[PDB]
Write a protein that holds these residues in place. Structure first.
Motif, PDB file in Angstrom:
ATOM      1  N   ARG A 170       0.886  -1.145   0.000  1.00 38.72           N
ATOM      2  CA  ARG A 170       0.000   0.000   0.000  1.00 38.72           C
ATOM      3  C   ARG A 170       0.925   1.195   0.000  1.00 38.72           C
ATOM      4  O   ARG A 170       1.318   1.708   1.041  1.00 38.72           O
ATOM      5  CB  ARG A 170      -0.933   0.011   1.215  1.00 38.72           C
ATOM      6  N   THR A 171       1.299   1.588  -1.205  1.00 34.90           N
ATOM      7  CA  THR A 171       2.094   2.767  -1.454  1.00 34.90           C
ATOM      8  C   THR A 171       1.431   3.482  -2.622  1.00 34.90           C
ATOM      9  O   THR A 171       0.643   2.900  -3.371  1.00 34.90           O
ATOM     10  CB  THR A 171       3.535   2.372  -1.803  1.00 34.90           C
ATOM     11  N   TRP A 172       1.749   4.758  -2.749  1.00 33.46           N
ATOM     12  CA  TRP A 172       1.234   5.619  -3.816  1.00 33.46           C
ATOM     13  C   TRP A 172       2.346   5.943  -4.806  1.00 33.46           C
ATOM     14  O   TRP A 172       3.423   6.366  -4.428  1.00 33.46           O
ATOM     15  CB  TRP A 172       0.732   6.904  -3.209  1.00 33.46           C
ATOM     16  N   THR A 173       2.112   5.748  -6.082  1.00 30.91           N
ATOM     17  CA  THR A 173       3.204   5.939  -7.000  1.00 30.91           C
ATOM     18  C   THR A 173       2.722   6.746  -8.152  1.00 30.91           C
ATOM     19  O   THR A 173       1.656   6.511  -8.660  1.00 30.91           O
ATOM     20  CB  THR A 173       3.849   4.591  -7.408  1.00 30.91           C
ATOM     21  N   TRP A 174       3.525   7.726  -8.550  1.00 28.11           N
ATOM     22  CA  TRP A 174       3.202   8.618  -9.671  1.00 28.11           C
ATOM     23  C   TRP A 174       3.436   7.943 -11.033  1.00 28.11           C
ATOM     24  O   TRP A 174       4.184   6.959 -11.140  1.00 28.11           O
ATOM     25  CB  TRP A 174       4.116   9.839  -9.642  1.00 28.11           C
ATOM     26  N   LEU A 178     -11.837   0.845  11.792  1.00 31.48           N
ATOM     27  CA  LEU A 178     -11.330   1.650  10.708  1.00 31.48           C
ATOM     28  C   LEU A 178     -10.559   2.754  11.363  1.00 31.48           C
ATOM     29  O   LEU A 178     -11.011   3.265  12.402  1.00 31.48           O
ATOM     30  CB  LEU A 178     -12.466   2.272   9.945  1.00 31.48           C
ATOM     31  N   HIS A 179      -9.409   3.136  10.790  1.00 29.50           N
ATOM     32  CA  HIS A 179      -8.612   4.184  11.432  1.00 29.50           C
ATOM     33  C   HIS A 179      -7.619   4.933  10.567  1.00 29.50           C
ATOM     34  O   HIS A 179      -7.332   4.559   9.435  1.00 29.50           O
ATOM     35  CB  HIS A 179      -7.911   3.642  12.699  1.00 29.50           C
ATOM     36  N   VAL A 180      -7.107   6.004  11.151  1.00 31.36           N
ATOM     37  CA  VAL A 180      -6.155   6.884  10.527  1.00 31.36           C
ATOM     38  C   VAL A 180      -5.226   7.363  11.633  1.00 31.36           C
ATOM     39  O   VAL A 180      -5.676   7.625  12.741  1.00 31.36           O
ATOM     40  CB  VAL A 180      -6.872   8.105   9.834  1.00 31.36           C
ATOM     41  N   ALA A 181      -3.942   7.470  11.336  1.00 33.79           N
ATOM     42  CA  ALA A 181      -2.990   8.019  12.279  1.00 33.79           C
ATOM     43  C   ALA A 181      -3.401   9.397  12.880  1.00 33.79           C
ATOM     44  O   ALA A 181      -3.980  10.234  12.207  1.00 33.79           O
ATOM     45  CB  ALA A 181      -1.659   8.142  11.578  1.00 33.79           C
ATOM     46  N   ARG A 182      -3.062   9.650  14.134  1.00 33.74           N
ATOM     47  CA  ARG A 182      -3.359  10.971  14.743  1.00 33.74           C
ATOM     48  C   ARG A 182      -2.717  12.134  13.989  1.00 33.74           C
ATOM     49  O   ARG A 182      -3.210  13.251  13.964  1.00 33.74           O
ATOM     50  CB  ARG A 182      -2.843  11.000  16.174  1.00 33.74           C
ATOM     51  N   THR A 205      -3.472   7.887   4.792  1.00 35.37           N
ATOM     52  CA  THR A 205      -3.575   6.435   4.813  1.00 35.37           C
ATOM     53  C   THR A 205      -4.682   6.051   5.757  1.00 35.37           C
ATOM     54  O   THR A 205      -4.700   6.490   6.920  1.00 35.37           O
ATOM     55  CB  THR A 205      -2.250   5.783   5.298  1.00 35.37           C
ATOM     56  N   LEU A 206      -5.581   5.211   5.266  1.00 42.06           N
ATOM     57  CA  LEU A 206      -6.723   4.768   6.051  1.00 42.06           C
ATOM     58  C   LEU A 206      -6.595   3.271   6.213  1.00 42.06           C
ATOM     59  O   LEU A 206      -6.363   2.572   5.232  1.00 42.06           O
ATOM     60  CB  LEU A 206      -8.035   5.101   5.335  1.00 42.06           C
ATOM     61  N   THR A 207      -6.782   2.771   7.431  1.00 42.03           N
ATOM     62  CA  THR A 207      -6.514   1.374   7.710  1.00 42.03           C
ATOM     63  C   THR A 207      -7.730   0.653   8.316  1.00 42.03           C
ATOM     64  O   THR A 207      -8.483   1.222   9.108  1.00 42.03           O
ATOM     65  CB  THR A 207      -5.265   1.279   8.616  1.00 42.03           C
ATOM     66  N   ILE A 208      -7.905  -0.597   7.891  1.00 42.54           N
ATOM     67  CA  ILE A 208      -8.871  -1.539   8.460  1.00 42.54           C
ATOM     68  C   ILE A 208      -8.063  -2.562   9.233  1.00 42.54           C
ATOM     69  O   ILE A 208      -7.153  -3.209   8.678  1.00 42.54           O
ATOM     70  CB  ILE A 208      -9.746  -2.232   7.377  1.00 42.54           C
ATOM     71  N   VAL A 210      -3.968   4.111   0.424  1.00 39.73           N
ATOM     72  CA  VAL A 210      -3.262   5.383   0.573  1.00 39.73           C
ATOM     73  C   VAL A 210      -3.883   6.316  -0.468  1.00 39.73           C
ATOM     74  O   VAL A 210      -4.073   5.925  -1.609  1.00 39.73           O
ATOM     75  CB  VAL A 210      -1.727   5.237   0.398  1.00 39.73           C
ATOM     76  N   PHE A 211      -4.228   7.522  -0.043  1.00 39.55           N
ATOM     77  CA  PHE A 211      -4.793   8.518  -0.895  1.00 39.55           C
ATOM     78  C   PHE A 211      -3.758   9.576  -1.032  1.00 39.55           C
ATOM     79  O   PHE A 211      -3.005   9.833  -0.090  1.00 39.55           O
ATOM     80  CB  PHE A 211      -5.992   9.186  -0.214  1.00 39.55           C
ATOM     81  N   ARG A 212      -3.776  10.250  -2.169  1.00 38.80           N
ATOM     82  CA  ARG A 212      -2.971  11.431  -2.322  1.00 38.80           C
ATOM     83  C   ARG A 212      -3.904  12.564  -2.544  1.00 38.80           C
ATOM     84  O   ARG A 212      -4.723  12.511  -3.459  1.00 38.80           O
ATOM     85  CB  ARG A 212      -1.988  11.375  -3.482  1.00 38.80           C
ATOM     86  N   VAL A 213      -3.713  13.621  -1.756  1.00 41.68           N
ATOM     87  CA  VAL A 213      -4.559  14.774  -1.829  1.00 41.68           C
ATOM     88  C   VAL A 213      -4.126  15.502  -3.070  1.00 41.68           C
ATOM     89  O   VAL A 213      -2.944  15.834  -3.205  1.00 41.68           O
ATOM     90  CB  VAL A 213      -4.398  15.675  -0.599  1.00 41.68           C
ATOM     91  N   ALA A 214      -5.088  15.740  -3.965  1.00 38.72           N
ATOM     92  CA  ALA A 214      -4.864  16.520  -5.212  1.00 38.72           C
ATOM     93  C   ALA A 214      -4.376  17.964  -5.013  1.00 38.72           C
ATOM     94  O   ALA A 214      -4.987  18.734  -4.302  1.00 38.72           O
ATOM     95  CB  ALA A 214      -6.119  16.541  -6.083  1.00 38.72           C
TER      96      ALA A 214
END
Ligand SMILES: [Ca+2]
Ligand SMILES: [Ca+2]
Ligand SMILES: [Ca+2]
Ligand SMILES: [Ca+2]
Ligand SMILES: [Ca+2]
Ligand SMILES: [Ca+2]
Ligand SMILES: [Ca+2]
Ligand SMILES: [Ca+2]
Ligand SMILES: [Ca+2]
Ligand SMILES: [Ca+2]
Lengths: 638, 638
Positions: free
Chosen positions: A118-122, A182-186, A241-244, A265-269
């Motif tokens: 789970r990585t984001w790649t251009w 479901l979670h996201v880092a602080r 990054t959003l995790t289950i 993993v999402f990348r904010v536009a």
């Protein structure tokens, strides 16, 4: 991940196996004594692999289970390991398994469709969902960005959000003994908000970083809607990054035990600008006292370029005629949604409310940066923020062009710069890889005062225009040579002192000031040549004279013609009021002679007592919104 | 860059040419009429190139000048362009040039020696000087980092700094009409300080971002010394760029005009940790009441590992015996200087002053992060910060290993994490690419409580040790099988209730608690397996039992033997006080049986009423400084 299941003949073991996971077996750690060898039998839904029909019992022999389908009920698939030796009757260790599907899904191929690493790649061979900052006002009612509160109020609002779907397949009683969270880092919770769709109620966000999901056994699909609340910036690289997590809750005495995790993993536009080479869609100005005739010329031009028009009346202007400077209209772009967004300068003069009140709206975003009271300079005005057309520079491609903004040549007590917060913001968008130019030598200090770009049918599809005294001297000298030295600059203007070509060419102070300007401009010329990969055939010089006034800073000698409005091929160029020769201002003719062969239509708009004497021109008094690039920013490899 | 020189027959032009620059000629822009063609003659120090013996006068024909050596005097090299046509007698435009050297130099090859693209690139084929944060106290006198003030007080201090040399070669009168300025962006001025060496006075720094240099004509060399004041961090990627600008000051009426810029880019060296596999050099502890016998065992061990020893007496401890937790000893490294640096935890208990007062010093750096009063948790203690040995993971190399620190499995109201500021700091160092592990299940919450690494002569050169209840059960069961079920754990301890192997193995609650721990540990096992590229043959299980106490968090059932001191091959392992069988604690024997075949010497240190009953062991009560990697961090490609 994987899991190591540790088997024993002491008694049977029970385990869960998430489909798509590598499950592994530790056989030797409790193999009873007496024993050389082992065999494995398993129910027909379990696939068993062994590297390194019965095998010796060597601790580095490797056994892995995968499961073809979700269990209908607990323990419905079985594994049986049989240990034996030369004279030792077989003994069986039993493993009961439950298979499940846990698929957290999102648009990672970037096609509008949700269907280990789970990585984001251009790039176009890369992967990772896109997420938009929900910075528009679809809410017709109030004046805040959609994303500032905790609720989805319109259903239109969902069009802006990104869809994530949890897809489970389990035995009917499975969430008796297991819970999903479901979670996201602080670290990232203040930058994303997540709604559960049933209608919609927030489940993750700035206030909460985890949420126990209420999920029935069987086949179930749960829909989430995600919005971002922050653009990439200096302190935010732009991934969320959003995790289950799957928890075992079987034992009522012990704490919950993690069994499985997956993520998206999402990348904010990023916020993206549009160069003058992009087809225009909507045009902006102010209306003030004794303005009317400027505005008709502009209106006529819009109409020829198919553009919506939009004006700001003196009740809102508050005397502020400089529509260029308070704002910049860019866009943000996801596979499912594209929408314009105003970058609103902290300039904060009379137009202060215009971006909030009139521009931000249904499918119109807002952003702002830098300090809102004080701490600012003229170089923060968005006449000092431009972008190039797409260019390739020594092999590296800038498919969205490169932001340009003005700066000093080095920091000093008298120098100005665009505020660090804006610079930082612009670089953090990545995809337009800002370049700093030298504009602090101009009184006002804006890059629009010495450059513009225009479409062109050949070459790379544009021309860089630059102001050029050299060119105005050559023209005027030429006119003197063919007898017209007597001609009068400022011909046709009342309460202004006509000057003849002959006396202009002989004025040594003026020739000095313009030589210094020539240097300031030429410095940028090579700078643009390098950082945009331009050649001379990409560039056109526009005859233009300057003078030095206060702090020896440079103003336009006659209307700054390069500070023009570009509506496709329809140029809205300031009226130089040049020396009239054979019926026509020789400036106008020189310009036309340079631009008309590229398909361009030059309209000379009179801005003299309206804008020019207030130290700005047509470009400075207007603004455009334009068509987003078709090229998808996420395909770049910055 | 390059410059475009614009020539005319109107009169001669005068220009400067910096050696190593591409100088270009615009010939067609003022070629007089009557003219087809041109020729070029130049004095013997000027080299002329023409692509695209006399040439036609076509605007895209290209002419470039380079200059072989610095001018001895103004205008001493000449260029003469001769325009001519079929019936037109030749006319000459003259160009007088002055050549100069301006070389801003620094250690960009990373070899200790200062001799277009100014970018910094990682790897052994890359380029860019290194710069150290001057965070030690060479100043014997006071208690501040060298770099907090504006002065070089010792000359020793210069050894820490990086050398930049400006190297000029000009006509004797050149700085009559030109001035050089040295500068740094306002963005970076608060992160670097630059001294001119004549002795040394600051010229750039947080207060000033530019400085006019006083430079004689001729051949001159000016030495600068640079220190950084900030480590790479979330808001600082770690590059600092210093620029030399050359200004034309010929005209007393006009502003200064930029003629030339060059730069060097420095990368501020990251803070780097040392794994237990790196040879030890100095050992740390506290002395407190009824401690003496622990400290002799440790003293003996140091001596066998060649280590300097260092203790902290109860006047400074203030009852704080946990030397592991308040600090971590890393290094920073440049080609010219390497020095240890203490990362000082915001834990801020009794040892609060120890890192400042006793560790920071001559060739000993200091750093700290996170909030100093409140806002903290046990997971901020540096028993929860470790690093792996070097590893390669699926082809990507981590030549300095990977920082490991403990975390929860997901954020909740009851969960703990290491403070964001530390996490951010550690990731920003880049070269050790931190990995998060699951340690929040432990009462104390530290990764040193379930893992350690030790050198090994084969394989990848280490073993990962992990605590293992599984292994302790197997051992104890084995002992029961050979008749020793009667044996007594805690044998030899007064005011403590002996328990027999038989009653331990039959205790179902204990067996449950340990099964939950087994899961918590196994989760990390696969996690380490993935993120460090480990295989089972890299791992050794150490027999260890736990129990769950408060908030169902896990403590050690007997002394946590994996919480050991590693001094090369000399291990300082807690004394389990196991059931004694055939003269020896079977735990000790099991351990020895696992470690001695790797060359390791196991010393069992008694910490029971000193540390174990206070919820920590040997590792928790000590600390080590170790040899920096020989591998140079800048050769990595993170
Ligand atoms: Ca909302
Ligand atoms: Ca919306
Ligand atoms: Ca504003
Ligand atoms: Ca919308
Ligand atoms: Ca603009
Ligand atoms: Ca100092
Ligand atoms: Ca120092
Ligand atoms: Ca501290
Ligand atoms: Ca030092
Ligand atoms: Ca540590």
């Amino acid at each position: 991940q994987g899991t190591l299941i540790r088997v024993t003949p002491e008694q049977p073991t029970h385990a869960v196996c998430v489909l798509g996971t590598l499950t592994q077996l530790d056989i030797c750690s409790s193999a009873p004594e007496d024993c050389t060898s082992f065999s494995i039998n398993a129910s027909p839904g379990v696939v068993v692999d062994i590297a390194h029909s019965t095998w010796p019992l060597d601790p580095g022999v490797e056994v892995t289970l995968t499961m073809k389908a979700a269990s209908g009920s607990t323990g419905d698939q079985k594994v049986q390991i049989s240990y034996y030796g030369p004279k030792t009757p077989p003994v069986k260790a039993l493993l009961y398994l439950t298979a499940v599907e846990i698929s957290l899904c999102a648009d990672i191929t970037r096609t509008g469709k949700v269907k280990d690493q789970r990585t984001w790649t251009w790039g176009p061979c890369g992967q990772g969902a896109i997420l938009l900052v929900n910075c528009d006002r679809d809410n017709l009612e109030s004046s805040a960005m959609d994303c500032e509160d905790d609720e989805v109020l319109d259903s239109e609002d969902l069009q802006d959000m990104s869809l994530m779907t949890l897809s489970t397949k389990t035995p009917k009683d499975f969430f008796t003994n297991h819970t999903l969270v479901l979670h996201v880092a602080r670290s990232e919770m203040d930058k994303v908000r997540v709604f559960q769709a049933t209608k919609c109620s927030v489940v993750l966000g700035p206030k909460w970083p985890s949420h126990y999901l209420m999920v029935p056994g069987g086949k179930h699909n749960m829909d989430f809607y995600v919005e971002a609340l922050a653009f990439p910036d200096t302190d935010f690289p732009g991934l969320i990054t959003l995790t289950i997590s799957l928890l075992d809750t079987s034992n009522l005495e012990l704490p919950e035990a993690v069994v499985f995790q997956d993520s998206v993993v999402f990348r904010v536009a990023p916020w993206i600008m549009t160069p003058n080479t992009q087809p225009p869609q909507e045009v902006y100005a102010c209306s003030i006292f004794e303005n009317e005739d400027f505005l008709k010329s502009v209106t006529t031009l819009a109409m020829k370029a198919k553009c919506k028009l939009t004006i700001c009346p003196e009740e809102e202007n508050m005397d502020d005629q400089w529509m260029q400077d308070e704002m910049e209209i860019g866009y943000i772009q996801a596979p499912h949604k594209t929408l314009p967004v105003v970058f609103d300068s902290p300039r904060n003069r009379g137009l202060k409310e215009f971006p909030i009140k009139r521009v931000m709206g249904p499918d119109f975003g807002y952003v702002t940066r830098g300090p809102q009271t004080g701490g600012i300079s003229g170089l923060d005005s968005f006449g000092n923020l431009e972008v190039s057309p797409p260019v390739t520079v020594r092999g590296k491609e800038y498919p969205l062009g490169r932001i340009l903004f003005g700066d000093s040549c080095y920091p000093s007590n008298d120098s100005r710069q665009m505020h660090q917060a804006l610079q930082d913001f612009l670089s953090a968008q990545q995809v337009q890889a800002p370049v700093k130019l030298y504009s602090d030598w101009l009184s006002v200090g804006h890059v629009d005062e010495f450059l513009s770009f225009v479409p062109a049918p050949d070459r790379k599809g544009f021309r860089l225009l630059l102001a050029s005294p050299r060119s105005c001297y050559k023209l005027f000298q030429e006119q003197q040579n063919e007898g017209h030295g007597e001609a009068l600059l400022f011909e046709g203007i009342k309460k202004k002192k006509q000057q003849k070509i002959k006396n202009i060419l002989s004025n040594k102070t003026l020739r000095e000031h313009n030589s210094f300007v020539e240097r300031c401009i030429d410095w940028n010329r090579e700078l643009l040549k390098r950082e945009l990969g331009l050649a001379e055939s990409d560039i056109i010089d526009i005859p233009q004279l300057f003078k030095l006034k206060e702090f020896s800073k440079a103003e336009a000698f006659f209307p700054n013609m390069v500070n023009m409005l570009v509506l496709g091929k329809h140029l809205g160029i300031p009226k130089p009021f040049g020396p009239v020769i054979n019926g026509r201002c020789c400036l106008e003719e020189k310009v036309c002679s340079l631009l008309e062969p590229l398909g361009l239509q030059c309209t000379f708009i009179n801005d003299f007592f309206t804008y020019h004497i207030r130290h700005g021109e047509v470009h400075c008094g207007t603004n455009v919104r334009r068509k987003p690039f078709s090229f998808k920013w996420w395909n770049m490899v910055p």
